[PDB]
Each structure stands twice: as structure tokens, then as C-alpha cells.
Ligand SMILES: O=c1ccn([C@@H]2O[C@H](COP(=O)(O)OP(=O)(O)O[C@H]3O[C@H](CO)[C@@H](O)[C@H](O)[C@H]3O)[C@@H](O)[C@H]2O)c(=O)[nH]1
Ligand SMILES: O=c1ccn([C@@H]2O[C@H](COP(=O)(O)OP(=O)(O)O[C@H]3O[C@H](CO)[C@@H](O)[C@H](O)[C@H]3O)[C@@H](O)[C@H]2O)c(=O)[nH]1
């Protein structure tokens with residue numbers, strides 16, 4: 001009933017059917033992680049039984065952790081790849097976008113799945129639920145999750161999309177960290193910096209391929225790290241810079257300032273990474 | 281230390297000094313109210329001792345209440361003015377902006393003060409603190425309050441201003457409902473609809489008069505009705521339509537939709553009321 005292919009109920013497919021449907025295509029899973037020692041093990045454990053079956057590859061992309069993220073992820077059997085290791089010829093910039101962009105060079109799967117590493121008790125059918133529409137459908141090259149409280153999503157991302165790309169008004173969670181896409185699409189698109197990366201991929205995919213190429217899947221309920229409002233403001237600012245730029249609007253480049261009563265300025269970036277294709 | 285005149289500490293002035301400084305100028309106070317029976321009395325009580333002294337006029341602008349707002353405000357001694365009564369030649373539209381715009385025709389003070397009517401225990405020096413810089417300073421024609429959690433302010437309004445009008449980055453509470461301004465300025469400016477009205481007045485004042493004409497004052501701590509996120513999303517959407525329009529950006533006019541799992545669409549308006557001047 002939406003112009004967008006939307007699975008509302010627990011998808012039907014079994015692990016075996018999904019695996020059959022691959023037909024020579026490979027699947028990489030990527031867990032970006034910055035200081036997530038309390039949750040990383042459980043996220044890995046939820047996925048690693050799929051490895052050498054439905055999933056051909058799982059990595060943790062460690063984004064500069066100074067806690068025990070790497071040693072715990074290793075103890076869980078995971079290959080852990082630093083930003084450095086992932087693309088050593090290019091100096092490292094901070095932010096999630098960079099980490100995901102670099103993960104394209106550390107993986108070789110025809111389909112790439114992203115899952116956040118701060119999730120509290122993730123379901124082991126997250127990945128199968130997400131590759132469903134890529135594997136069985138035709139035309140689909142991006143799958144976003146939705147769930148059941150997304151303050152930045154509900155107050156910033158979705159109202160700005162109603163304002164400037166109303167066609168995407170039917171995406172329920174445009175900022176979701178859990179999503180899958182073809183390598184062909186991801187290495188052809190630029191990667192916005194920091195927390196701008198999801199909203200950039202969504203709009204560029206739509207602008208380049210239209211809605212027919214985009215699916216969304218219910219993953220149930222989502223629980224993750226709840227962050228203080230001051231941190232979310234910084235995030236929101238980067239979401240706005242990236243969204244305005246994709247819509248042709250000039251962004252000042254001036255970072256958000258907050259007065260807690262003292263003055264702090266958060267970084268914002270107007271620099272995207274290019275399509276990973278150009279690094280061939 | 282800011283390009284904006286900012287009173288950080290309890291203003292010095294006394295009620296008598298402020299009253300002397302009026303020099304023939306009159307002061308109207310306006311309380312917009314939609315279904316605020318639990319708080320309206322205390323807000324009125326906090327201000328009505330100023331009447332016939334510092335304040336020449338106090339009204340409640342009743343915005344269509346179906347609870348006991350009017351009868352309680354009356355029992356508190358307040359003149360209660362409906363949207364109808366305030367400007368009978370023009371049919372009533374919904375939203376806060378309309379109510380404030382109409383209040384310009386129901387008042388005659390050279391200075392107009394707005395105070396929200398859902399405030400929990402407001403301080404009786406709110407109004408004196410707000411008219412301070414209009415009464416004593418020179419050049420000032422708008423005074424906004426700030427305070428000490430403003431989710432729409434911190435995630436939408438202030439980051440969008442950093443993006444599109446960075447000069448206003450130093451306004452700490454651009455959406456505050458407690459503020460004062462000259463009649464000359466207010467009847468010269470258009471009034472954005474619904475919850476767009478504050479952000480519209482701020483940007484138009486700046487664009488027309490620059491920062492020198494704008495002051496802000498600490499009013500301490502603010503407590504008010506906490507609204508559900510779905511309601512705030514609608515608010516945020518109107519804040520965005522109004523902000524984009526003042527910045528020269530085309531807004532789709534498409535209202536926000538939410539899926540709670542069922543589909544609802546909230547109204548958004550691209551229609552401003554004209555300067556009240558044209559209704560002379
Ligand atoms: O520099 C960074 C920052 C974050 N992360 C990881 O990225 C994931 C999501 O980060 P988080 O700090 O938990 O973001 P959220 O506050 O949850 O933001 C939501 O909205 C963001 C904007 O789209 C998305 O990037 C997020 O995935 C989404 O969960 C987590 O596993 C982090 O460890 C990094 O790897 N590097
Ligand atoms: O149609 C309406 C809606 C609201 N109100 C009154 O306006 C005031 C503020 O409304 P509220 O629902 O409490 O808004 P907030 O969620 O607090 O929104 C904040 O941010 C808004 C956008 O700028 C401002 O309009 C508000 O004053 C500010 O408090 C209250 O006294 C309401 O009774 C009306 O009179 N008519």
C-alpha cells in the first residue's frame with residue numbers, strides 16, 4: 001500500500017531458502033565499532049553462526065576504540081579490521097561514515113550488510129531479514145530496517161524529508177544503522193562524513209534509482225545506547241549538512257555551538273568521501 | 281562577549297525604576313491559551329499585581345479552549361479575548377501564530393509581552409526581566425528569554441540556524457514562548473502559522489534590523505507541559521517550513537506522516553498572516 005516495498009510481518013523465508021537463492025552471490029557483514037565493549041560480543045554471537053553458510057564474511061570495523069572492543073571481539077572469533085588496515089594508502093578521518101566507507105575495501109561480498117554494535121540483544125534473524133529482498137526480489141539494491149524513541153529521526157530526518165524530498169516520506173527509519181545493499185550501488189556512491197552517512201545513501205540511492213530499488217523490513221524492537229541530548233544535537237547538525245547538500249542547498253559549514261553556562265563548538269563536515277570505485 | 285546583548289545574571293532594575301523609564305510608553309501582556317485550565321490561574325496571578333503599574337494591560341487570548349480555561353482566567357480577574365472577538369472581520373484559522381497575530385488588534389501597548397500559559401510556577405519577575413532592555417537600552421526592539429530539554433530547539437531549530445543563518449547561533453532559546461517586542465516591529469512583520477511563529481519573528485527581525493536590535497535575558501528555570509514525540513514532530517515540521525521559507529528555500533508543503541502501525545498525516549501551512557499594519 002506504500003510506493004515502497006515494505007515487509008510488515010516476520011519475513012517468510014528460511015535460512016536454507018535464502019542461501020539457495022544466492023546463486024553465486026556472496027554476503028559480507030560489517031560491524032562498525034567505537035568503544036562498544038559492553039555489547040560487541042552479543043552482536044557478533046548473534047551472527048557468527050551464519051558464517052560459511054548464508055554469510056561468507058563477517059568483520060568488526062574498529063573505529064579507534066580505546067576500551068576492550070578489539071580483544072573481546074577477537075575472543076568472539078571475529079576478524080577485527082582497523083580503519084588503517086582497511087585502506088592504508090589514505091589517512092584516517094574521524095566519524096562513522098569514514099568507517100563504513102573504508103569497510104568497502106576490507107570486504108569482497110556482492111552484498112554488504114551493516115549492523116550497529118551497540119545493540120542490546122539483537123535477534124539472530126536480523127541479517128536474514130535484511131538480505132531477503134535483495135536475494136529474492138528483483139530491482140532491489142538497498143534495504144533499510146524499521147522498528148518500534150528516534151528523536152533525531154522523528155524530529156529532524158523525517159520532517160526534513162517531508163519538506164525537501166516528500167517522496168521518501170514513507171521510509172519509516174531513514175537513519176537506521178541496520179541495512180544491506182549491493183556492492184555495485186555502494187562503491188558507486190559517495191560517503192557522507194560522520195553521522196551523515198545514512199541519510200546521504202538514502203537520498204543518493206533514490207535520486208539515482210528511484211523508489212523501486214529500495215525496500216524496508218521490520219526487525220521488531222530496537223534497543224541501543226541512549227546518548228545525551230548535546231551529542232544528538234551535534235549528530236543532527238551533520239544530518240542537516242548532508243541532507244541540505246544532497247538537496248542543492250548551500251550549508252554554512254558553521255558547527256553547532258552549545259552553552260552548558262559555557263561555550264563549546266562541535267565539528268561539522270562538508271566533505272564527502274568519493275565513490276570507492278575511483279580507488280581501484 | 282556575544283554579538284548579541286545577553287543578560288546572564290538576575291537583572292538589576294527594580295519595578296519602580298522600570299516604571300519610571302517608560303516615559304509615556306505603555307505595556308501590554310498577552311497570554312495565549314489552548315486548554316490550559318491546570319496552569320492558567322497561577323500564570324495570571326504571577327503578573328496581575330503589575331497591572332495599573334508597570335503593566336497597563338493584561339489579556340488571555342483564548343485559542344478555542346473547550347476545558348475551563350476561560351471561566352478560571354475570569355475568576356482570576358483577567359480579560360479573556362477569543363480569536364473571534366480579537367478581529368471579527370477575519371475568519372479564524374487554527375494554530376498559535378494566528379492567536380498571537382490576532383492579539384495585536386486586541387491590545388494597544390507600545391510594547392507587547394508574550395508569556396505561555398502552560399508554565400508551572402512562573403516567577404513574578406518574568407515580565408520585568410523581559411521589558412528591561414526595551415525600556416533602558418537603545419536600539420532594542422525584540423527580547424527573547426533563555427533558561428535551563430528543548431528537544432525541538434536543540435535538535436531542530438538551533439542546528440538549522442547554524443546551517444542557514446549562522447549569525448543567530450548565539451540565540452540560546454530561539455523558540456522561547458516568553459518574549460517582548462515593540463508594537464512598531466510586530467505590526468510590521470508577517471506572522472507565520474501554528475508553531476512557526478517564533479522562528480519567523482526571530483529571522484525577520486534579524487534580516488530587517490540586525491543583531492543590535494535583539495536582546496536575550498535569563499529567566500532561570502522553565503517547566504511546562506511535556507508533549508508526546510508525535511506532537512513535537514508535527515511542530516518541528518512547521519518550524520522547518522517557516523525557517524526554510526525565510527531562508528529562500530522552497531518547501532514541499534507536504535505534511536509529516538507517522539505510522540503508529542497505522543498512517544496519520546499532520547497539517548503544515550505555508551501561509552503567513554500579513555503585517556497587522558495592512559488591516560488599519
Ligand atoms: O565515529 C564513529 C561513531 C560511531 N560508530 C559506530 O556506529 C554505530 C552507530 O553509532 P551511534 O553512536 O550508536 O549512533 P546513534 O545515536 O544510534 O544514531 C542513529 O542515527 C545515526 C545517523 O544516521 C546512524 O548513523 C546510527 O547508526 C543510528 O543508530 C555504533 O555501533 C558505533 O559504535 C563508529 O564506528 N564510529
Ligand atoms: O493553537 C494553539 C497552540 C498553542 N497555544 C498556546 O501556546 C503556548 C505554547 O504552546 P505549547 O503547546 O505549550 O508549545 P511548546 O511545545 O512548549 O513549544 C515551544 O516551541 C514553540 C515553537 O516556537 C513555541 O511556539 C512555544 O511557545 C514553545 O514553548 C501555550 O500556552 C498554548 O496554550 C495556543 O494558544 N494556540
Ligand SMILES: [Cl-]
Pocket residue numbers: 188
Ligand atoms: Cl556510475
Ligand SMILES: [Cl-]
Pocket residue numbers: 468
Ligand atoms: Cl515597513
Ligand SMILES: [Mn+2]
Pocket residue numbers: 116118224225
Ligand atoms: Mn546507537
Ligand SMILES: [Mn+2]
Pocket residue numbers: 396398504505
Ligand atoms: Mn509548552
